[model samples]
Structure formats: structure tokens, C-alpha cells
Target: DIKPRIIRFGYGLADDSPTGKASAHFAEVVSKLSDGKMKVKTFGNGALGPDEQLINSLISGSGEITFVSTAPIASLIPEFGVFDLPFLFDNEKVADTVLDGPEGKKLLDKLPAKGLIGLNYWENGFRNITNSRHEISKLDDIGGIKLRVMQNQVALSVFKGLGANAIPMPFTELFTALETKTVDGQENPLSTIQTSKFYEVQPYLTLSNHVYTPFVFLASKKWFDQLSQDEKDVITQAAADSQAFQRKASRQGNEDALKYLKEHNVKVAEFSTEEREKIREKVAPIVESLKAKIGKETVEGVLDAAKKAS
Candidate 1:
């Protein structure tokens, strides 16, 4: 029998965000599985700290659990940056398949040795470009544009490879940076643009769908190791079960967000297949550059998995 316990889970998103909803659903499932013996208390809107900070907290055992973006995770495990490869997955569904398959589990299994226990992956969907400047119609349009990217080398290199003046910035500071015109553009999913109201500040949206971001659900290994087998089973099983519902909600959220952005007069553009291929060609060297850092075989493994899934 599992004893009563409280689990603190935190993330950096609004309460209504897909991650927020998924965290809430995860908690509900945990409570049900544990029969109220375990309580998952969630903090949102970066209440815990930024993803990097929260990841550190989890490693130090100061935080019980968190949902962090893979960009920061790459700081601890460079191989995780394999997912940040430009034009990685064809779509969100393909991403889900790869993440839930063997290759994903192999990556997740590496977390326990790093002081965090990987639970399951949640979708952040595909990232798109938005700018206060002009619409990005072709590869040339991205040149000389000052774009805000996540504080990670892969992201910085990806945009720079595309000829953008990529500025690595934290998510918490992005909205203010954009509002003040500190950067000409930033990239994120439609749900993020809608939730953060970036459409109000930026006039153009390019559905580049260049990269997909995955939210890694992680628990402190220190805390997880202390749990009874029964409790661990409950937590793990509940996390796995929440995936289907959370992914569906995430897809729907993006759909609804795109509609909202359109209603708010955010100009949207998408790359034709030929245009997208040009981007792939331009970034090929940059992607190859990361092969050594992220491991050539590991990158090939992910590409193989993605191909099979798609």
C-alpha cells in the first residue's frame, strides 16, 4: 500500500495552455490511481521558474516534478538536441510516434542516471515563425531578420543557417522583447502565439513548421526512488494513460489558436514544398555540424524512426 504524499509539479505556461491542461489531467489521473493517497499540486505560468531553472531544481531534489522543453534538456544531454534538427518530423503525429517508440524510450531511460526520472513526453507541437516585419515568402525573406530563438546552440545555429540574425533569448523575456521591437521575429507554435498574444504585437505569421518541440515530463529521481513500487506504478501508468488525451487536446488547441489568430488579423503564410526544400538544403550543413555533438548514430536512429513512423 502507498502512503499519503504530495507531489509538486510545475511548468512554464498559462493555466489554460495545453501543457497546463495536460498537467491537470495528469494530476487527476494520479489522484484517481492513488485513491487520494497522493496529491499532485501544480504550479503554472513559470511559477516554479524557467525551464532551465526548474530542471536544475529537479536535479537538486528541490522540485518534485516538472514539464520542461527539450531545448534546455539538451544542455544536460547534448544528444537530446537531435530533436531540434531543422525540418525533423513531417508533422506532430509523426513526432508522437517516434517519441513513444523505442528510440524515445531509450532517451527517456537515460534520465534516471541524471537525477531525474523521465515520465512521458507531451506535445508542444511544431514551431512557426512570426514577425513584426514582412511576411516570409521565401528563403531570402528570412535573411537579415533579427529572430529570437531559444537559448540553445541548435536553435541558434538553425536560424543562423537560415540567414537570420538569431538571438538566443529566454521564453519569459520573449513577449517584452517582441513588444518593444527588440527582435524582428520569434518562432513558436500557433497555440503559443495565441496564448502569449504575440499576434497582437507581431503582424505576420509564417507557418514554417520547421521544428517540433516536445515537453518532457520529469520527476526528481531522489523523490521517485523513495516511492513504494505501488506508488511508482501508479505514477508511471497514469502518465502513460494521459498521453492520448493530452495529445488530442494539444492538436485541438493548436487548431483553435490558429482560428483565433486569424480572427485577430494575424497575417499567415506557408511555404510551398519547393520553398521548404530550399530551407532543408540551406540547413543541411548546420544539421550535419551537430552530428558529432549529438552522436551520428543517434541522429541516424531518430531519422530512421521518423521515416518508419511517417
Candidate 2:
């Protein structure tokens, strides 16, 4: 008789939220698909750590599975930075069509060379700015204010390109930072901002729809290489199914969360596409300026592939 393989699933979002629900779905699928030969124990709400730190723990083999944003990983591999470029993905469908397609697969396959296995990309939705400062409608509005950026250097540089004094900080410290005025503003997806309860601290919410951040599902290569082929297939299929489930749930969360904000007296302003594009163009130079750090060819590959899919 063979004993079931015990696996720990961890993420940075609440257990019942989109991210955690998807993770739970993965656990269920993997267990059933494996005929109860595998089990996933979940840890939600960043009980693990912030996104970047979570990935570091996965690499160190402290975690079996982790849900994280692609933004911070871009710092390690510049090609990952393209996802942080503002206005690149117009909608969730366009993002899913491309990422689940060949272009996304090609990129995911390369993670093994970097000590991790990329299984799937989950939709995180468009990012917006929520601040306690004046309403931000255009690029100039974000300037002069201290905006908290993820560990992704490209994001830091992109906001800085727009005249913002970008500050890098972990998500755990963000709520207090905004509350204490340690930072003037921060940007994230609607689901994230609402779940993090950032609205209570910052009164202004702008639907900027800048970069659409995606959560990357990764496994430790060291651990993966040790798995049997059957085990590998079980994990991959579970991740793929979970990816679809998460996107659908998160899509609903986006709409519902916005409605919740409006009803709760949170100020909501929708910026014009013209205003968004102007900022996109303004920060476009950040891509080229820092290409040398991540390799120009890799950046072009993602951009080119993204264009073909789009």
C-alpha cells in the first residue's frame, strides 16, 4: 500500500477569496484526480509572507506551492518585467488568451532554468491608484507623491518615469504606511485593495487600469525533479484547472468590490482612456531604458509574442 503524498498550499490572499478559493479548487482537483493519493494543506492570507518573500521561501524549499504576482519576479528576470508595463493588457480576456497560449507557455517553460517551475498564470485584474491625496487623473497628478511600488524594479522605474517618487515596500507594511502618511499612495488591483482594506486608510480611488498584474503559480524545481511523472501530471492539471477557476471568480470580485466601495462612501473616479494612454506613453521609456539590465532580446521576445497574441 502506498501512502498519500502530503503537500502544503500557500498564498497571500484570504482563504475564501478568489485566490484562496482557486487554491482550494486546486486542492480538491488534485486530490480527486490523484484518487486520494495526494493531499494539499492550504495556508491563506499571507500566513506565509508577502508575495516576494513567499517566492523566496518556495525557492528555499520551505513551501510546496505558492500563489504570487509576476511583478516582483521581474526583478530577477527582466523578461518578467514586461507584465508591469502600463496599459499593455486591455482586458482580462486578452490577457488570458495570450498567457494561456503559446506565448505564455514559452515564457513559463523558461522558469526551470531559474530554479522554479511555472505551472500557470492567474488573472489579477487591472491595477488602480488609491490615495489620500488629490484626485489623480493624469500623469502629472501622480508626480511629487510617494507611491509604493512592488519589489519589481520596472514598476519603480515606470512610476518614476511619470515623475512619481516611487518607494519600494512590502505589502504587509502598506496599510500602516498609508495610514501614517509614510507614503502618499499605493496601487493594486481592486480585489486586492478591498481585501487589504486600503480604502479605510486612503479616501481617493482612481480606476486607472494601468498594469494588469497576474499571479504566477510556481513549484520548486528541486522538489519537482524528484516527483514521479504521475505526480507531475497531477500537479500541472490541477494548476491549469485552478487558473481558470480563479480568473472567473476574480472577475466577479472586481465588479462586486467596486460596487461595495461606492456604497460604502468610498470616492471612486474613472479616468479617461486618453488620460491612461498618455501615462502609458510617458512611462514607455522605462522599458527601453532598463532593457540592458534584463537583456534587450528577452524583452523584445515577450513584447513581440504579446503583440502576435493581441
Candidate 3:
């Protein structure tokens, strides 16, 4: 008994970004599976609202679906903060394996009680540092810079641990912040740097890979519960298909973005092995400090999964 329905899927990235592309793919899959009875209309580039706003809309049944980064959701579910731990995954492949595995589902399961249903995870990929002030090749290079971080305690701790003045801000406001010198630096995946045109404002790019961020494709539980089982099945399958497509597109996007950054004359820095060690050593205590809040089992589970995936 599937009825005709329209779904409004909102996200923060530009339409051509990997998340945007995958979101479109999900809509296509859903339409085809539902025989055109279900249609997904996508709003990109924060057109719907910032992540926190979109999430609140979903909770109140005013929005249908969205793809949001975990940083914002960490405030709602503290368990997600574990993923923000520095140096958690070795690389994108390891992150993929860990997220598609059991521990990932465990995290997703925590959403329904909070009025959201997590369909699957997409990639924002490994994050790097970018700044207008200076190049970051060593720990000391990070000092004294006012860096914009996602509004997450772990992110704040990591940047402060590295000696930067961490300022929590929404991604929607980041470009202006960088342009106006409100923040001297910010961190994100290379694809974001290119797509968001952060290069226009940020002159220095460092391949820090300090954190791997994931995008969660979530639906409003209130709206989802109104769907028939067949409808739900189509949605789940479409999400799975989109996950595969998004991951591949995201990985390719990162490669192309790096090339584009260099071609555009952005200064790129790579950390020396010694410098990497200095950062790793500095942020080690953050993981221990968060154990009580995020739960030791949850933290250990992610670490154990990452180890096995590696």
C-alpha cells in the first residue's frame, strides 16, 4: 500500500559535490523502485538551512531527509564524539570498512530514540588544515592562529592541544569568516576546499588528515513511520546504493581537488614524520579525557574496529 509521496532532502554541499551527487542518486533509485510514486527533491548549499536547523526541522516533522556531518550531531548524541578522536582511522578505506561494519550500525542505532533514522554513512573524507596566515609544517606552526573548528568538544580540544586558538563555528559561515579574517584557519577535506572555494580565502593548505569526517543520511522518524514497509524497503536499498556511489565519488573528488588546489597556486604543506609524531603525541590525552563522556566501550569499539579494518 505505498502511496505517492514527495521527499525533501536537504544538504550543505553544492549540487556537484560528492554528497550532492550521491543524494541525487538516492532520489533516482527511490523513484525507480517506487514506480514514480516516491520522489525526492533535493535542496543544496544550505538552502534548507544550516545542519542544526535542518535537524531540528526533521525532528519536528517539518523536514523529510538530510545529509549532515557528525560534528553537529555529536551535541545530540555524545557517542558520536568518539569518531572525532584524532588519528582514529588510518585512511579512507579503513574508515569505509569500519563504518560499513558492526560498530557503525551500533552508532546508527542510537538515532531512532532521538527522532531520526540513519539510513547510512557517506564520506566527507579525511580532513586537512587550511589557513590564510601561514603554512603548517610543524606543531609550532599551528600556534597563535585563530582556527575555526566544527562545534564539537573533541575538535576544540584537538586544535587547542596543537596550540591554535580554536573557535567553534558553523560551516555555512566559514567562507566569510576566513575572508574577513574572523578566523585565520579552518580544516576540511580537500574536496570541500575546492568545492566551497576556500582556496580563494585560504592561501595555505596542509595535508594533516587529522580527522576523518562522515556524512550521515538521516530521515525524520516521524515522517518515516508513516511510510509502508515497501516504501521503507525502497528507501533502505536506495541509501545502500548511494553509499557505494558516494564513497567512490568522494575518493575521486579528493584526488581532483588536490590537483585543482595546486593548479590554482594554493600553497600546500606536508608534515614530516617527526612533525606528525609531535601532533599525535600532543592529542593523545584528548582520547582519554573523553572516555567518561563518550563511554570507554564505545571508544574502544571504534579503535578496535579501525585496527581490524587497517
Ranking by TM-score: 3, 1, 2
Model 3, stretches more than 4 Å misplaced? none
Count of clashes, each model: 0, 0, 0
| Candidate 2 residue 241 C-alpha distance from true site, Å | 1.1
Cα lDDT listed for each candidate: 0.88, 0.82, 0.90
Q: TM-scores of all models?
A: 0.97, 0.93, 0.98
Model 1, range 1-310, lDDT digits (tens) per residue?
7999988988887778887888899899999998898999999888888899889899998888888888888888888888788777888878988998998988898888789988989888899999998999799999999999987888888889899999988787788899999999899989988887778889999988889998888999998998999999998898887777788988999999988898877899999889988998999988999898787877999999999999
Looking at candidate 1, the ten consecutive residues that score lowest on lDDT are: 10-19
- Kindly give the stretch of ten consecutive residues in candidate 2 with the minimal lDDT sum: 1-10
At residue 144, what lDDT does model 1 achieve?
96
As for model 3, its CA RMSD to the true structure in angstroms is: 0.9
Candidate 2 lDDT score at position 174: 88
The alpha-carbon deviation from the true structure for residue 150 of candidate 1, after best TM-score superposition, in angstroms, is 1.4
